[PDB]
């Protein structure tokens, strides 16, 4: 019915008016490309050949467009159509008369997409504003869109079968709009959290931590090669940190050439000892933490997620705030290229040697588990004798579960800490966790020491069978193993009952992901529809479509969210 | 023992039987995270291998068969009853977990191009097209014949030379996109000759005809099935996954010279990023690499049953130490470009890698001024129909956030469904307009002078007309 057509989603009101299928759009699998800049995207030649951007013939560009017209559709840098002044369209594929090929001012030649053509890149779902960013086009000879790795974080895209949509603006006006509003370098900093959206990620973060250690010393030829990939190099080789006996540069010395202009920043490495700041060696840091950049030169410190990641006050954030968006784009790209070429010399890997720990550490983990199981048994015996006293506001079952969970969690965390103590400097799990590129201390602990308690619906594994978790366990068994505690690590391998309980926990995780996607989508749509028309007028009042004043000044101070920074008042706290 | 239960009434035959068919192919399942086993269960259904031994006789749509399937070097005991050895899906591949050039970052994979040239992960894609000669129409007969442009009033300019006399292309003839696989003609009633009814190849198939069959179907009409074969050499978009839930496309392909090489001369067939392992905690992958190294050297297929208690990482490590390698499986690698030893020692070992059905060639689509729908006069939908990608409501909200009003306007009006209507000034209802006659008149006012041209999406015109059919009057007034 008419009401059925209009009412539902995919109806005329929403499925055909608010959103609709569009021309001049392309889609293909995305794959990485560290060599492309932040703003560049790699487009296959077939997608580039099908999509055409109409160019008006001017006295300036008549020769170039004439050559494109002569090439035709077959040769790649060609023109698919000619649009005359009358509006007549001459498709060049079917034979055009040699008279028709002649061009005059006012004709519109529809050239194939060429290098440097601004396009809009999208990945569904388009949750935030950074999910649609303008990319320059670079044509490369395979059939996948290729984008830089730093740009993956705004899109929330990884290269495991993902796909992205390419929209080509067809007019100079809309092309200028994209170029000056939505290009990738212009949206490095999000107004949502006044932090940079994009940061150094994956191999480059892991390797920048290693590159910036005090230990790293580079010889002459390696410095030559690293400087070769630096786009903004002045052409002057820095004086090596160690002139004699053999000229040897340092990783920080080369990274100082990457840092844009003169940027001053102080951040702390992840492994910074808390006592260091108060005690001596505060400035001459024993562990080479406390990153300090003065006059755009890395005086000291080990770079990590905190210094080069997506956080307020990062080196990239200070670069965007101080140097500008263009120099910051160059900064991102140069970090990636130089560090990735050093990683060929140094290399990274993950093996079983990383998971395995010392025999003493394994014995310590086993002892912690033994005494934890004994403690749980003691609590159970107290409960059976009714000696246990209920916690206020909780039933005896609830307080028994609380105490048992506390004991098991303390054992789990202590075993994790023992495993993390065992890790050597060379351990690669530790490299990735410390750099912040991937992983967490929890994952290391589960790999090496103890997987941990399996909880479903916020409780230990429930009694699915009559008064027992599995048929193999005795009825009314509240012990650690029966209710889901997985003593073995992933490296050690789970026992079969622990395997089933672990499967139950993982299933809860999967279900939570599936449900959260839908519910969050609905919430986001409702918020947008409620606040879509609110904007800052030229009075600087924030008014809706009805012109009712939502706010007299935007944010009550009339400032935009990206420019602002965290600061301390310093008059508030001190005593009189 | 220390008394736990003295009244056992039954015993499990083997705990590994709790897993299903797809989960039984995972080696060392107990050493993986649970979501990763769940993901491998779904990826294993999509892998490429010889699906059945009678695949030559069968004419199925979308059949992929790998050139050189190999049985796993590290196999579960329950795989024997699944017949995975008889019909394997995947190739054991020398895999290095390393960061080489940044093209394996995220989940992508660097593949060896020399290995790909030697037959590594090469597959064939068979597509079958079926057509039926239907004479059921009263005066319509869908005869099989080669259409002729002069004889048939309805025709298309795609190549018709391939078709033989019967209207079916002979096997062994190359077919490029937009070629006529089957030529069929419907005789046209002469109300007062021919509307073309040929079937055309899916774009970019670029295959060679394998088998052409002519039979009579259940209805008794003549039935023709044509199977087109396309070889599929792996590219830099194809999706490869291991048996431990690690999926990823091919980031780039380096030749054997460029790939890092051990001192023995072994260059990894696949290089995966070390960043995939820690967050996903698929240690079964690492243990499988170690056991595969030991198995390849020893010459016996490794046992990876889930719960064994006789196979430990330490035992596998000592076994590997016996064969002259580092006990944890690491190897000293040399950089292919410069020859210098890589300072870190890279973890190299054979690992069963699968090739999933998702390939970039099947997933690449581009649209520019294509056909439009009848109802909405908007671009079609789908890769087969050359449809444009949808600019959803979330996308328009992002563009509103940007402040790109004109890009939003182009994308939502000018690119999709531009249209013009004529609207009476006195009454907002649309008015009849003869551009060729140059007379524009509005019914209901008997007014000709006051008419204005309005540019609106065709979808909006359809919305307003559907409102009018519901007796709602959407009077759009320019004033």
């Amino acid at each position: 019915s008419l009401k059925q057509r209009l009412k539902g989603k995919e109806g005329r009101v929403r499925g055909n008016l608010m959103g609709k299928r569009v021309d001049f759009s392309a889609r293909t699998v995305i794959t990485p490309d560290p060599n492309l800049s932040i703003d560049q995207v790699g487009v296959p030649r077939s997608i580039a050949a099908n999509m055409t951007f109409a160019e008006i013939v001017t006295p300036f560009n008549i020769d170039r467009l004439q050559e494109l017209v002569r090439r035709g559709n077959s040769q790649y840098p060609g023109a698919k159509y000619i649009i005359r002044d009358n509006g007549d369209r001459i498709d060049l594929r079917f034979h055009p008369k040699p008279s028709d090929l002649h061009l005059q001012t006012g004709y519109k030649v529809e050239r194939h997409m060429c290098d440097g053509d601004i396009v809009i890149f999208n990945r569904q779902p388009t949750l935030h504003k950074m999910s649609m960013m303008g990319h320059r086009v670079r044509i490369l000879p395979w059939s996948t869109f290729r984008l830089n790795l730093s740009v993956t974080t705004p899109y929330n895209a990884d290269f495991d079968g993902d796909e992205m949509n390419l929209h080509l603006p067809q007019s100079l006006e809309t092309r200028a709009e994209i170029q000056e509003l939505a290009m990738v370098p212009r949206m490095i900093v999000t107004p949502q959290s006044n932090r940079p959206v994009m940061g150094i990620v994956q191999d480059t973060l892991t390797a920048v931590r290693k590159f910036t250690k005090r230990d790293v010393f580079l010889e002459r030829g390696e410095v030559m090669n690293l400087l070769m990939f630096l786009s903004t190099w002045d052409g002057k080789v820095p004086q090596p940190a160690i002139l004699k006996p053999r000229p040897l540069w340092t990783g920080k010395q080369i990274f100082s050439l990457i840092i844009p202009g003169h940027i001053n920043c102080i951040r702390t490495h992840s492994t910074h000892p808390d006592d260091e700041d108060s005690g001596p060696y505060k400035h001459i840091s024993p562990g080479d933490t406390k990153v300090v950049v003065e006059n755009g030169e890395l005086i000291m410190g080990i770079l990590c997620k905190k210094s080069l990641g997506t956080s307020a006050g990062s080196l990239v954030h200070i670069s965007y705030l101080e140097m500008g968006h263009d120099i910051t784009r160059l900064f991102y790209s140069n970090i990636q290229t130089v560090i990735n070429n050093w990683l060929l010399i140094e290399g990274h890997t993950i093996g079983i040697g990383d998971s395995i720990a010392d025999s003493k550490t394994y014995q310590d983990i086993q002892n912690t588990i033994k005494k934890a199981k004994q403690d749980v048994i003691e609590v159970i015996e107290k409960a059976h004798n009714n000696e246990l006293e209920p916690t206020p506001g909780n039933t005896l079952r609830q307080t028994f579960e609380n105490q048992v969970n506390r004991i098991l969690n303390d054992a789990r965390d202590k075993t994790g800490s023992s495993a993390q103590k065992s890790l050597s400097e060379y351990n690669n799990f530790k490299s990735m966790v410390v750099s912040g590129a991937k992983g967490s201390k929890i994952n290391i602990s589960q790999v090496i020491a103890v997987v941990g308690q399996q909880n479903v619906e916020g409780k230990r594994i429930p009694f699915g069978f009559k008064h027992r978790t599995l048929p193999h366990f005795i009825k009314d068994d509240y012990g650690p193993e029966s209710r889901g505690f997985v003593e073995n690590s992933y490296l050690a391998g789970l026992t079969p009952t622990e395997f089933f309980f672990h499967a139950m926990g993982g299933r809860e995780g999967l279900i939570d992901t599936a449900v959260k996607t839908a519910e969050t989508g609905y919430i986001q749509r409702r918020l947008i529809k409620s606040m879509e028309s609110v904007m800052v007028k030229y009075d600087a009042t924030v008014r809706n479509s009805i012109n009712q004043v939502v706010q007299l000044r935007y944010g009550e101070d009339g400032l935009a969210g990206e420019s602002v920074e965290f600061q301390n008042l310093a008059t508030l706290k001190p005593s009189n | 023992e220390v008394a736990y239960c003295s009244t056992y009434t039954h015993c499990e035959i083997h705990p590994s039987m709790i897993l299903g068919v797809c989960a039984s192919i995972i080696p060392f399942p107990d050493h993986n995270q649970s979501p990763r086993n769940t993901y491998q269960s779904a990826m294993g259904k999509q892998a490429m291998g010889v699906y059945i031994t009678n695949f030559h006789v069968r004419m199925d749509t979308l059949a992929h068969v790998l050139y050189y399937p190999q049985k796993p070097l590290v196999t579960t005991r329950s795989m024997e009853y699944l017949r995975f050895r008889e019909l394997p899906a995947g190739i054991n591949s020398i895999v290095a977990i390393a960061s080489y050039t940044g093209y394996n970052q995220e989940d992508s994979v660097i593949m060896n191009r020399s290995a790909v040239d030697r037959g590594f992960f090469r597959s064939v894609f068979y597509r079958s097209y079926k057509e039926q000669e239907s004479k059921k129409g009263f005066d319509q007969e869908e005869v099989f014949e080669k259409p002729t442009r002069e004889t048939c009033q309805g025709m298309r300019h795609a190549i018709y030379d391939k078709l033989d006399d019967d209207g079916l292309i002979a096997p062994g003839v190359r077919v490029s996109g937009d070629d006529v696989i089957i030529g069929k003609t419907v005789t046209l009633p002469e109300n007062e000759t021919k509307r073309d009814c040929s079937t055309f190849l899916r774009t970019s198939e670029t295959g060679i005809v394998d088998q052409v069959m002519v039979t009579l179907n259940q209805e008794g009409y003549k039935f023709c099935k044509i199977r087109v074969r396309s070889v599929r050499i792996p590219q830099i978009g194809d999706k490869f996954a291991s048996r431990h839930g690690q999926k990823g496309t091919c980031g780039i392909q380096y030749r054997q010279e460029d790939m890092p090489f051990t001192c023995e001369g072994i260059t990894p067939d696949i290089i995966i990023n070390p960043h995939a392992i820690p967050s996903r905690m698929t240690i079964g992958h690492l243990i499988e690499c170690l056991q595969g190294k030991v198995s390849a050297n020893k010459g016996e297929i490794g046992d990876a049953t889930p719960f064994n208690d006789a196979v430990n990482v330490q035992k596998i490590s000592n076994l590997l130490s016996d064969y002259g390698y580092h006990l944890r499986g690491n190897e000293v690698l040399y950089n292919g470009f410069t020859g210098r030893k890589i300072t870190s020692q890279i973890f190299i070992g054979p690992t069963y890698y699968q090739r999933l059905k998702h390939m970039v060639d099947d997933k690449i689509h581009s649209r520019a001024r294509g056909p439009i729908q009848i109802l909405n006069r908007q671009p079609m939908e789908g890769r087969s129909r050359d449809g444009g990608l949808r600019f959803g409501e979330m996308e328009r909200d992002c563009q509103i956030a940007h402040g790109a009003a004109q890009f939003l306007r182009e994308r939502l009006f000018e690119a999709s469904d531009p249209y013009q209507v004529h609207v009476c000034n006195l009454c907002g209802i649309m008015a009849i307009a003869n551009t060729r006659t140059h007379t524009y008149e509005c019914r209901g006012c008997r007014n000709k002078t006051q008419i204005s041209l309005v540019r609106m999406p065709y979808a909006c015109k359809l919305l307003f007309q559907e409102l009018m059919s519901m007796s709602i009057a959407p009077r759009m007034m320019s004033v």
Partner: peptide, 8 residues
């Protein structure tokens, strides 16, 4: 899969 306070 860790604990009651962590993740499943």
């Amino acid at each position: 899969i860790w604990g009651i306070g962590c993740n499943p």
